[PDB]
Scaffold this motif. Structure first.
Motif, PDB file in Angstrom:
ATOM      1  N   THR A   3      26.777  85.306 -18.620  1.00 22.87           N
ATOM      2  CA  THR A   3      25.929  84.492 -17.764  1.00 22.87           C
ATOM      3  C   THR A   3      26.056  84.954 -16.320  1.00 22.87           C
ATOM      4  OG1 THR A   3      27.664  82.817 -17.504  1.00 22.87           O
ATOM      5  CG2 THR A   3      26.052  82.476 -19.264  1.00 22.87           C
ATOM      6  N   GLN A  18      21.936  77.281 -11.116  1.00 23.49           N
ATOM      7  CA  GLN A  18      21.636  77.492 -12.523  1.00 23.49           C
ATOM      8  C   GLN A  18      22.562  78.560 -13.082  1.00 23.49           C
ATOM      9  OE1 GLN A  18      19.692  75.467 -13.927  1.00 23.49           O
ATOM     10  NE2 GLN A  18      18.428  74.668 -12.251  1.00 23.49           N
ATOM     11  N   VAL A  20      22.522  81.035 -16.218  1.00 20.94           N
ATOM     12  CA  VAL A  20      21.506  81.553 -17.124  1.00 20.94           C
ATOM     13  C   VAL A  20      22.168  82.417 -18.184  1.00 20.94           C
ATOM     14  CG1 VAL A  20      19.561  81.430 -15.557  1.00 20.94           C
ATOM     15  CG2 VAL A  20      21.046  83.424 -15.504  1.00 20.94           C
ATOM     16  N   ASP A  21      21.681  82.293 -19.413  1.00 22.32           N
ATOM     17  CA  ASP A  21      22.088  83.164 -20.506  1.00 22.32           C
ATOM     18  C   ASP A  21      21.406  84.516 -20.341  1.00 22.32           C
ATOM     19  OD1 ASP A  21      22.470  84.465 -22.990  1.00 22.32           O
ATOM     20  OD2 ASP A  21      22.711  82.526 -23.994  1.00 22.32           O
ATOM     21  N   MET A  24      18.653  85.648 -22.847  1.00 21.07           N
ATOM     22  CA  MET A  24      17.393  84.928 -22.935  1.00 21.07           C
ATOM     23  C   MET A  24      16.541  85.242 -21.715  1.00 21.07           C
ATOM     24  SD  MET A  24      18.790  81.415 -24.511  1.00 21.07           S
ATOM     25  CE  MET A  24      17.560  80.119 -24.615  1.00 21.07           C
ATOM     26  N   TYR A  26      14.024  84.455 -18.589  1.00 15.26           N
ATOM     27  CA  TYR A  26      13.900  83.346 -17.651  1.00 15.26           C
ATOM     28  C   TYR A  26      12.905  82.309 -18.156  1.00 15.26           C
ATOM     29  CZ  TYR A  26      16.651  85.820 -14.156  1.00 15.26           C
ATOM     30  OH  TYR A  26      17.671  86.441 -13.475  1.00 15.26           O
ATOM     31  N   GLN A  28      12.347  81.399 -21.290  1.00 15.30           N
ATOM     32  CA  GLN A  28      12.960  80.568 -22.319  1.00 15.30           C
ATOM     33  C   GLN A  28      13.871  79.498 -21.731  1.00 15.30           C
ATOM     34  N   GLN A  29      14.312  79.661 -20.485  1.00 19.61           N
ATOM     35  CA  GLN A  29      15.264  78.751 -19.858  1.00 19.61           C
ATOM     36  C   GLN A  29      14.662  77.901 -18.749  1.00 19.61           C
ATOM     37  OE1 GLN A  29      19.308  80.546 -19.658  1.00 19.61           O
ATOM     38  NE2 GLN A  29      18.255  82.514 -19.417  1.00 19.61           N
ATOM     39  N   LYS A  44      14.560  89.487 -18.823  1.00 23.85           N
ATOM     40  CA  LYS A  44      15.889  88.923 -18.999  1.00 23.85           C
ATOM     41  C   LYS A  44      16.734  89.159 -17.751  1.00 23.85           C
ATOM     42  CE  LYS A  44      16.118  88.887 -23.991  1.00 23.85           C
ATOM     43  NZ  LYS A  44      16.386  89.735 -25.186  1.00 23.85           N
TER      44      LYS A  44
END
Ligand SMILES: [Zn+2]
Length: 314
Positions: A3, A18, A20-21, A24, A26, A28-29, A44
């Motif tokens: 992350t 934030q 973020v994974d 994934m 941006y 998707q989140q 990503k």
């Protein structure tokens, strides 16, 4: 999972932390996400993205309030259109022409150039903090955000044909003109007199003639009875007035006006030029500058200074 820490925003002032994974997108989140105007929705997160600020759509009550307080709009597509335009305007050039910030030509942006140059010659204060902040930087030479905002507010995309009179209308709608008042009187030989009062934006704009003096003397307009009525200016209270009319050959004399817009073309294709009256007449065509003592051309908008006027007609 791996992350990084990034910040989301809608006004680029209030940040929201934030985590973020990295596996994934941006989208998707956060939903539609932009980085300095670039759409990273399907991208990503990179390591270089750590700590950077990203624009997102208002997807919670807090963001909804921050967005409105800044832009004064709840159009769902505003941010998308603002970010898409910013990706182009941030590449434009904004040179200082005769002390004013202009725009080098690009993607049919001539109307924005003369709109921006006109703003720097009239008294006007914007209400939305977005325009305040961006206009202050445009005045300093960094007008990329201001131009992207004008495109967004006006529902125009980069490269689209624009109208100066329409553009100024939108901008005046987002400005403080509550102190502006106008009184007209329409005289028909068959239907007598009829006085009308206008306030705000409608008080500083008229469509029909370019000459402020002729407006005071009287202009011919159709009356319902079929005759031609005469409309003239009774009282004016504003720091400026905008006189507009369909393009037509018109002579701009030095010292009788503040600035004007020239238009060459038609309803589907054309180019705008700016004419400002200083020690002499200067024509600003984006980054181009020429001068002359006398000017004649297809003028479509003329701006005059004003404070308070009252007619002598009785
Ligand atoms: Zn009549």
């Amino acid at each position: 999972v791996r992350t990084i820490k990034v910040f989301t925003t809608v006004d680029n002032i209030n940040l929201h932390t934030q985590v973020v994974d990295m596996s994934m997108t941006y989208g998707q989140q956060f939903g539609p996400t932009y980085l300095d105007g670039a759409d990273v929705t399907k991208i990503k997160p990179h390591n270089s993205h750590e700590g950077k600020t990203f624009y997102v759509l208002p997807n919670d009550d807090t963001l909804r309030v921050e967005a409105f307080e800044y832009y004064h709009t709840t159009d769902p597509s505003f941010l998308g259109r603002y970010m898409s335009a910013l990706n182009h305007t941030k590449k434009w050039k904004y040179p200082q022409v005769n002390g004013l910030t202009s725009i080098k030509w690009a993607d049919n942006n001539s109307y924005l150039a003369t709109a921006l140059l006109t703003l720097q010659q009239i008294e006007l204060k914007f209400n939305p903090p977005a325009l305040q902040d961006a206009y202050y930087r445009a005045r300093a030479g960094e007008a990329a955000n201001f131009c992207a905002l004008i495109l967004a507010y006006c529902n125009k995309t980069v490269g689209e044909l624009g109208d100066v009179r329409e553009t100024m209308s939108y901008l005046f709608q987002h400005a403080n003109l509550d102190s502006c008042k106008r009184v007209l009187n329409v005289v028909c030989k068959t239907c007598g007199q009829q006085q009308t009062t206008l306030k705000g934006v409608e008080a500083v704009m008229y469509m029909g003639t370019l000459s402020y003096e002729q407006f005071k003397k009287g202009v011919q307009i159709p009356c319902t009875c079929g005759k031609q009525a005469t409309k003239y200016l009774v009282q004016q209270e504003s720091p400026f007035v905008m006189m507009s009319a369909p393009p037509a050959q018109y002579e701009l004399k030095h010292g009788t006006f503040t600035c004007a817009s020239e238009y060459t073309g038609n309803y589907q294709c054309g180019h705008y030029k700016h004419i400002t009256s200083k020690e002499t007449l200067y024509c600003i065509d984006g980054a181009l500058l020429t001068k002359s003592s006398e000017y004649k051309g297809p003028i479509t908008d003329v701006f005059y200074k004003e404070n308070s006027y009252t007619t002598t007609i009785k």
